[PDB]
């Protein structure tokens, strides 16, 4: 089933035709971005990042016994009432394996003393395995939850020891946590560390750290008001997007030599940019 052609055999002829059409679309990027989040206006970069998270990366394992990460995580920080929770809501709507929470999460080892068995009830992380775990109110988590989230991000496992029962449970998923800056106002003068109350390792493990600003643009305000009134008054359907996403995940691309050299050059340029003192970077 993991072979793409095997699922294509499971899929009907029309489904394969639609998949081929989606694969041959030149503007597939823009069409997917528009269809995935139709209601939200603007903020195309965040939509692109979320789409890339949904597609994901190719996992690898070293000969030394270690395992390489094949998932990416996105954290959204923005001013209040900037529709950041709407992103999580639409992601949960689209993804059947998404698990929405509001900051229990790991596991619950309840011993059935009748049978003397430690039956474990899966937490939010476990249920969201091999998918996306949307965690709103990321900055309101307790210290225990922060430790558990950092451990999940670092070792993609869940370790539990209740009533002298030590166990380790695998958990491989992407996190789309969202949180507000300290005080509700993003100070461009301060860096991300000062604006957001998060532990350093958790902040470091994240990628594609998107930041939202209200910007009070009058034209955008008119567009938003008109959109709200029209609500009071898609190139590809969700099923087609799901089929294409599964088909793409069944693929496994590999890096080429020219791409390798270009990656090295771009990394050199990025590190030179960061080392440059012309403008201080936020991280």
């Amino acid at each position: 089933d993991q072979t793409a052609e095997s699922i294509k055999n499971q899929m009907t002829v029309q489904e394969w035709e639609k998949v081929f059409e989606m694969s041959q679309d030149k503007n597939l990027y823009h069409n997917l971005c528009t269809s995935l989040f139709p209601t939200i206006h603007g903020n195309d970069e965040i939509k692109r990042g979320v789409l890339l998270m949904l597609f994901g990366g190719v996992p690898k394992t070293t000969m030394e016994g270690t395992s390489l990460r094949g998932d990416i995580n996105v954290c959204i920080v923005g001013d209040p009432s900037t529709s950041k929770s709407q992103f999580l809501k639409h992601v949960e709507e689209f993804s059947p394996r998404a698990v929405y929470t509001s900051g229990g999460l790991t596991a619950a080892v309840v011993k059935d003393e009748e049978s003397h068995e430690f039956v474990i009830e899966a937490g939010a992380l476990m249920l969201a395995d091999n998918g996306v775990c949307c965690i709103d109110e990321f900055d309101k988590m307790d210290l225990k939850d922060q430790v558990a989230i950092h451990e999940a991000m670092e070792q993609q496992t869940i370790s539990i020891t209740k009533a002298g029962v030590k166990a380790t449970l695998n958990a491989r998923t992407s996190i789309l946590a969202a949180a507000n800056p300290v005080g509700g106002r993003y100070e461009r003068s301060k860096s991300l560390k000062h604006n957001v109350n998060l532990s350093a390792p958790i902040m470091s493990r994240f990628d594609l750290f998107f930041i939202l600003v209200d910007e009070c643009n009058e034209v955008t305000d008119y567009a938003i008001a008109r959109r709200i009134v029209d609500l009071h008054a898609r190139v590809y359907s969700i099923e087609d997007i799901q089929r294409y996403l599964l088909f793409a995940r069944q693929f496994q691309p590999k890096i080429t030599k020219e791409a390798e050299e270009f990656i090295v050059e771009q990394y050199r340029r990025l590190r030179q940019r960061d080392g440059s003192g012309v403008a201080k970077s936020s991280w």
Binding site: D214, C216, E218, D221, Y222, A225, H232, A233
Partner: protein
Amino acid sequence: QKLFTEERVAMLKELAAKPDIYERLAAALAPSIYEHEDIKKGILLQLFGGTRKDFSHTGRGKFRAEVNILLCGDPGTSKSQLLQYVFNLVPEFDKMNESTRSVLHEVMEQSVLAAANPVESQWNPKKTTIENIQLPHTLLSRFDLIFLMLDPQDEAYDRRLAHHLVALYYQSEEQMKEEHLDMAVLKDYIAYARTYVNPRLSEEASQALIEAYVSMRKIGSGRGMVSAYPRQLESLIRLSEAHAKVRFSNKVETIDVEEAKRLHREALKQSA
């Protein structure tokens, strides 16, 4: 749905036909209160309220149509009198705790007529309203209308207000009904407006609401001014719906939107 008699319906429509029906009904709720016309208009709109719309068709959460009103000011303006008149007619906000306000915010995450008092028991003109009441931005943003009731130190006004207070502590409801408008007629008007009047947004009213929101955002773009938020658009929609219900109109007019904006401006005391 009361079986409103045709004579009663005719009388209610004749009342609605009067151009002063908004002000007449605002005064009809305890006209013995010294002025406070805008506050009475807001309370009248709260009694009428907006139109209940179920937005499950759009997938989005259903929008609340109830209007939340906050009355702020020092004691001595007879707020308790008008509150009791409203309660009879229709059946500790100063001391709010931060844990309780957080619980209330969490509850609101899933019509309120509140009376506020200063922490110092006296209104400080040098201090802003938010500082004087000691309330958060999140909670204050969930009140559609916030009326600033100042207590002037005038001997004539204070004498009138005290006399009215002791009258309320002494006069029976029979004399109040005999002297003022009959309360049954006002109750029938309110029931008729809340039952049969279901105004709908027109294109002109829609454009007026959108332009009003744009103007509010422009006001918020200025330095030191409160930035407009999307909940303000919904508040304006609810106020326009209530005002349209006042005139028994089944369509929301631009006049309703302008009146809602004027009432919101007078409540917030933007000019000062």
